[PDB]
Amino acid sequence: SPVRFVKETNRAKSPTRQSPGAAGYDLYSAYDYTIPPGERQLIKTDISMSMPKFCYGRIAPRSGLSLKGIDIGGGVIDEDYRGNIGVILINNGKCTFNVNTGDRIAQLIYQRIYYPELEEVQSL
Amino acid sequence: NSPVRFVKETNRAKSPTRQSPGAAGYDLYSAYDYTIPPGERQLIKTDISMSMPKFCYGRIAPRSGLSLKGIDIGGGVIDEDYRGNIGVILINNGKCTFNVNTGDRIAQLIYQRIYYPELEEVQSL
C-alpha cells in the first residue's frame, strides 16, 4: 500500500530513506534560496503526495541544521494535502543561510494520529 | 473509538473543530483578547478542557498561515491525564505586533498516538 508521489518539476528529488530505523524520509530543496539571519523562507520541494490514512506528515528538523540555528516552522502536512510540500526553514542563527537545489532540508515523518468525535459535557 | 469529552469553562470557549475529514488537527480558538509584541510569547487561554484519549497526547501544532507570518508554538504537550484549561503559547517571531482577538484560531490540536513502554536499565545494548 505505497504512498504515491508526483514531481511537479524535474528539479524535485524523490524523498530518500537510508536505514530501517530512520524516523522518516529526507526532503530536498527544488530551488536556490538565501535566508538572512532572523528571517524565514518557504522552501519548495516540488513533491506532492497522496498521504496515508489516519496519519499526518510532520516536517521535522535535521539535527545538523538545528545545531546551526536552523529551525522548522509550521510543518503539519495533512492527510488530504495534494499540493506542493513546503518546508519553512527558520534561520535563528547569526549568519545568512544558503539553500541550494538538491540540499537536504528536513525529514518527513508519517505520524500516526487519532480522529475522535468530540462531544461537550457539563463536567469531566 | 468513543468520543472525546470536553468542557467549555466559560461561554467564550469554542468547540475544537476539524476543518475537513482529512485534516490532521482540531482548531483551537482564543477565548480572550491579547496583544503580543515582537520577540515575545503569550499563554493564550482556550477555556477548553478535555478528557484526553488513551495512549495519546494532544500536540498543540501551528497553523501554516501564522507560521509564515512568524508565529510559532511553544510547549504544546497536552498529557492524557491533563484536566485543566488548555493553553497555547504563541511566540511572535515576526517584526510587528501580533493581535489576538477572541474567537481567532491560534493553533491546531493533533491527537498523536504514543507508547508507554517500561524502561529497563542495562549494562550494554
Add this chain to the structure above:
Amino acid sequence: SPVRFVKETNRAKSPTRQSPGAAGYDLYSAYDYTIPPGERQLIKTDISMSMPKFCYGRIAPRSGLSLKGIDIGGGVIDEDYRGNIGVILINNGKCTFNVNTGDRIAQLIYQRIYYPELEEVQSL
C-alpha cells in the same frame, strides 16, 4: 517490548513518567551548562536506548520552561539511534539560562509512526 537503556556515566538519571497519564519520560542534564539569550546548546543526558519498533522518540518541551522562553531544537531520536541522547535547548528568553547537573530539561515521547513505501507516479 521494554526499552533497554544505558547510563554512559553515573551522572545520568533514569528517565521516568511523572504520572500514568503523562506523555513523556523526563530527561535530565548530566552536566552543567550556561545558555546566553538568543543562543542554543546541545545538552547531554548520558542515556542511550534501544528504541521501540515503528516509533521515534521526540524531544519535547517542558511547559514551565517554555513559558520562560526555553524551546527545543532538533529532537528527532530515530529508532536505530544507539548514541548519547542530546537535548537542544534554545534560550529565546531575555536573560542567561542556567542548567545544573540533574536538572529536568525536556521529556521524551515515544511517538508511533508509519514506514510506508514510496512510488513515483505521473498523477495522484
